[PDB]
């Protein structure tokens, strides 16, 4: 069941490059997702076609880029990139963590 | 503008009964929102008859009660309550966090 989310009963999906991911739970509509960076690991930039997203920084921190907009974000901060625009980060500290959140889903994660 | 969310830029609103919250950002389709809550705070019984919603943990521990099934979680932990679903929480710890999101925006928090 999806209902709920346990962190510690679930295991980490290695992406290669110092960055790993949990898919956390979803409905059609809305999916919560999981991303562990290493130190100065790099999520390289990119777009959605379809899919509004908004990160919430919950450990450590990131220079996040989006659409030509660099800004440091810590623990508590968070920012969105809507459909289309072009977003990426890098890591500054070890264990930094996003909580990606997605409208609709992404099929592509199941 | 709403691209980046900064925790130490933003106030907190008030809903009394030790909670707080704030609105981070949205599109229309995508809304998060920072929930605060004292230890022993109670996040009332409610369901959302349009919206979807996840929730994550972002600190302290709260005893979560969706559709009748009661489970204690902790930061980094997460559930989810579709259109319909009854859910409620308990914070069991002082400065407890849960990161909403919705889908769409909750037009009654602008
Ligand atoms: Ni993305
Ligand atoms: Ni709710």
Chains 1, 2 share one sequence.
Not at 12 to 23: A, H, P, Q, S, T
Not at 33 to 57: L, P, S, T, W
Not at 70 to 88: F, P, S, T
């Amino acid at each position: 069941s999806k209902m709920f989310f346990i962190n510690d009963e679930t295991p980490w999906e290695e992406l290669g490059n110092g960055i790993k991911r949990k898919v956390m739970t979803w409905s059609d509509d809305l999916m919560m997702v999981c991303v562990h960076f290493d130190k100065g690991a790099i999520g390289v930039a990119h777009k959605h076609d379809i899919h509004d997203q908004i990160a919430y920084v919950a450990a450590g921190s990131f220079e996040v880029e989006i659409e030509g907009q660099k800004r440091i974000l810590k623990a508590g901060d968070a920012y969105r990139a809507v459909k289309n625009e072009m977003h990426g980060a890098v890591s500054l500290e070890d264990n930094s963590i996003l909580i990606d959140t997605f409208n609709p889903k992404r099929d592509d994660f199941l």
